[PDB]
């Protein structure tokens, strides 16, 4: 059903209208305060992500258990790619919230945060150089949701192909030649490999400071325990 029938334009418009809002931080130089603000922000973002995921064409058709699995698998990836997208027009900076601009120096408070910060900045620098469009971003984020946990399925692959056809459509409507269409497609999808890496690095750090007592939210704890 519902997703495979829609045209590329209808696919884009659906994803654009489904976009989660940009939330604000609580109104930093401490490990406790730093993680506290990020934890609070991430938890409130998760609630909007779940509803965004619902408006993702094809995600509804999945059973509840599979919807849970995909969200548990890619929640940090989706949070990070959104952060990277928000930080595009802020080079050398990470826009967690409109009232929370951070550079790599402020990540020195929390262990492991500096390394992830640089990887996040490098990703944002890549989107800038590639001049990533919002229509392409919403496609990449939907792909992460459907792909990341698909091997841990036939219908999901069909929806993934639809988003692929959608990405090519966007590039074809941009004036790019066939060679430039495949190539840019490859360049975008290869970044998702790096986003996966940052998520895994971010996951193990969160779990590290979870057993070592900032008190993570109950929702975050559930998402985190899905990765053991």
């Amino acid at each position: 059903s519902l997703a495979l029938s829609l045209t590329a334009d209808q696919m884009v418009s659906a994803l654009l209208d489904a976009e989660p809002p940009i939330l604000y931080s609580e109104y930093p130089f401490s490990e406790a305060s730093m993680m506290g603000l990020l934890t609070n922000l991430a938890d409130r973002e998760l609630v909007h992500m779940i509803n965004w995921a619902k408006r993702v064409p094809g995600f509804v058709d999945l059973t509840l258990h599979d919807q849970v699995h995909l969200l548990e698998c890619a929640w940090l990836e989706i949070l990070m790619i959104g952060l990277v997208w928000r930080s595009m027009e802020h080079p050398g900076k990470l826009l967690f919230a409109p009232n929370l601009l951070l550079d790599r120096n402020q990540g020195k408070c929390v262990e492991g945060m500096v390394e992830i910060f640089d990887m996040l900045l490098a990703t944002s620098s890549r989107f800038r150089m590639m001049n990533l469009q919002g229509e392409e971003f919403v496609c990449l984020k939907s792909i992460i949701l459907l792909n990341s946990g698909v091997y841990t399925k036939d219908h999901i692959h069909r929806v993934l192909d639809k988003i692929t056809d959608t990405l090519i459509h966007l590039m074809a409507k941009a004036g790019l030649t066939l060679q430039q269409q495949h190539q840019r497609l490859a360049q975008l999808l290869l970044i998702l490999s790096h986003i996966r890496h940052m998520s895994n690095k971010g996951m193990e750090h969160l779990y590290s400071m979870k057993c070592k007592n900032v008190p993570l939210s109950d929702l975050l704890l559930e998402m985190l325990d899905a990765h053991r």
């Binding site: 609630v47 779940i50 509803n51 619902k54 509840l64 919807q67 849970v68 969200l71 548990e72 109950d218 929702l219 559930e222 998402m223």
Partner: peptide, 10 residues
């Protein structure tokens, strides 16, 4: 069971 369950249904 899970909070993710309720938010996915609500």
């Amino acid at each position: 069971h899970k909070i993710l369950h309720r938010l996915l249904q609500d």
